[PDB]
């Protein structure tokens, strides 16, 4: 049967969805408890948050992981396995919106200075936030790539850590020197570009998956030579590779043979060699006689 070699690709996926669900679930509880500490800390202090969207970011990334367990349907024939890639794009988009709003809020503070703020509250608030974010980063943190959902709930955690550094640095200089208060808002600006830089290597490895591009991990040239290693085959055209999710790849190609007879042996030999370089989700390979091959058609050009 042609489904014999798919066990390895099926076995690994089941372990990764359970392992990633457990790790993300534990971190959600810590965030929920940490938020509750603000309310019980005080009334006036708690009256004056950013942690509200943290609950949403840790709910979408976990709710979307449940739909990936759904079965097939006459629509969405492959399945719901791409819900994690598309469900981890909204989380990264949320980082851009929150930073943009916070930058706009900081801009208003620059033109209109304020003095009602007190440094005592800032120091105690920064210390509590720094500890919670640092521990939450550690628990989230041929070799398979990282999951496409734990890689989108980790950039947000490191995003809030930088703001914690910025507020501590800004508050520290105020105590040492009360003057030059105009340099307080610019601390956010100098520590906001870094948040918009760390989200550039994620929004590229995740945007070539949503437009049928070859994922990181497999090389086009390596696969092309592997098929040609078989003595029976002659040439390959219209090779197609695309990634259904981050660590699942699919293959589809044409093969031209020299001898029409005993073509079943060629099909079995090619499949075994292809599967010896990567665990493929599925593979579909045609056979075409050499006498019908034509080189003048445009579609066979790379």
Q: Is 220 in the site for a copy of itself (CB under 8 A)?
A: yes
Can you tell me the distance from the alpha carbon of 149 to that of 19, in angstroms, rounded to the nearest whole number? Answer: 12
Give the span between the Cα atoms of 196 and 200, in whole angstroms: 7
Cα separation, 287 vs 285, in Å, equals: 7
Q: How far is the CB of 99 from Zn ion (least distance, A)?
A: 9
d(CA 290, CA 177): 83
State yes or no: residue 1 binds a copy of itself (CB under 8 A): yes
Is residue 84 marked as binding?
no
Q: How far apart are CA 99 and CA 104, in angstroms?
A: 9
Which segment (12-20, 140-148, 224-232, 254-262) binds Zn ion by CB under 5 A?
254-262
Distance CA 35, CA 200 (A): 29
Picked from a copy of itself, Zn ion, none, the partner binding residue 214 (CB below 5 to 8 A depending on kind) is: a copy of itself
Judged by CB under 8 A, the chain residues 189 through 208 that form the site for a copy of itself are: 208
Quick one: 260 or 276, whose CB is closer to a copy of itself? 260
How many residues belong to the site for a copy of itself (CB under 8 A)? 49
Contact window for Zn ion (CB under 5 A) among 59-67, 83-91, 121-129, 291-299: 291-299
Measured from the CB atom, is 82 or 156 closer to a copy of itself? 82
Q: What residues numbered 152-191 form the site for Zn ion, per CB under 5 A?
A: 160
DSSP 108-157: HHHHS------HHHHHHHHHHHHHHHHHHHHHH---PPPPTTTTTTTHHH
Out of 3, 177, 264, 268, name the contact with Zn ion by CB under 5 A.
3
Task: Give the length of the chain.
Answer: 302
Contact yes or no for 158/256 (Cβ under 8 A): no
Point out which span in 41-49, 50-58, 140-148, 284-292 binds a copy of itself (CB under 8 A): 284-292
**Phi, psi dihedrals of residue 237, rounded to the nearest 5°:** -135, 155
DSSP characters over 70-110: ----SSSSS-STTHHHHHTHHHHHHHHHHHHHHHHHHHHHH
**What is the CA angle 185-190-193, rounded to 5?**
125
81 is in an annotated binding site: yes
Using CB under 8 A, pick the residue from 135, 193, 260, 276 that binds a copy of itself: 260
Q: For residue 153, what are the contacts with CB-CB under 8 A and spacing of at least 6?
A: 24, 27, 57, 58, 61, 91, 140
Options 40-48, 56-64, 214-222, 227-235: segment touching a copy of itself (CB under 8 A): 214-222
* 104 counts as binding a copy of itself under rule CB under 8 A: no
Choose the stretch contacting a copy of itself; rule: CB under 8 A; options: 47-55, 68-76, 118-126, 134-142: 68-76
Binding-site residue positions for Zn(2+): 1-3, 50, 54, 81, 156, 160, 237, 254, 281, 288, 297, 300
Residues engaged in binding a copy of itself (CB under 8 A): 1-3, 6, 72, 74-78, 80, 82-83, 86, 208, 210-214, 220-221, 238-242, 244, 252, 254, 260, 263-264, 267, 282, 284-289, 292-294, 297-300, 302
């Amino acid at each position: 049967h042609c489904h014999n070699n798919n066990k390895k690709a099926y076995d690994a996926r089941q372990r990764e969805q359970t392992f990633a669900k457990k790790k993300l679930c534990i971190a959600s509880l810590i965030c929920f408890v940490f938020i509750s500490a603000e309310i019980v800390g005080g009334y006036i202090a708690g009256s004056l948050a950013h942690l509200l969207v943290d609950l949403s970011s840790f709910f979408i990334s976990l709710c979307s992981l449940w739909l990936s367990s759904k079965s097939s349907t006459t629509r969405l024939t492959f399945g719901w396995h791409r819900a994690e890639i598309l469900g981890a794009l909204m989380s990264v988009i949320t980082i851009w919106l929150v930073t943009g709003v916070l930058v706009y809020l900081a801009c208003e503070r620059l033109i209109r200075p304020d003095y009602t703020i007190d440094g005592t509250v800032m120091l105690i608030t920064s210390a509590c936030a720094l500890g919670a974010n640092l521990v939450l980063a550690l628990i989230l943190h041929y070799k398979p790539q990282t999951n496409a959902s734990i890689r989108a709930a980790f950039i947000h955690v490191i995003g809030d850590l930088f703001q914690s550094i910025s507020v501590l640095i800004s508050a520290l200089i105020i105590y040492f020197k009360p003057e030059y208060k105009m340099a307080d808002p610019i601390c956010t600006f100098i520590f906001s570009i870094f948040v918009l830089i760390t989200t550039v290597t994620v929004l590229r490895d995740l945007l070539t998956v949503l437009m049928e591009g070859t994922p990181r991990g497999i090389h086009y040239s390596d696969v092309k030579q592997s098929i040609l290693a078989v003595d029976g085959v002659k040439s390959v055209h219209s090779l197609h590779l695309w990634a259904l999710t981050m660590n699942q790849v699919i293959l589809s190609a044409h093969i031209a043979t020299d001898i029409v007879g005993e073509s079943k042996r060629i099909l079995k030999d090619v499949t075994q060699n292809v599967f010896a370089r990567f665990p493929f989700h599925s593979v579909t390979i045609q056979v075409e006689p050499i006498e019908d091959q034509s080189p003048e058609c445009m579609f066979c050009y790379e």
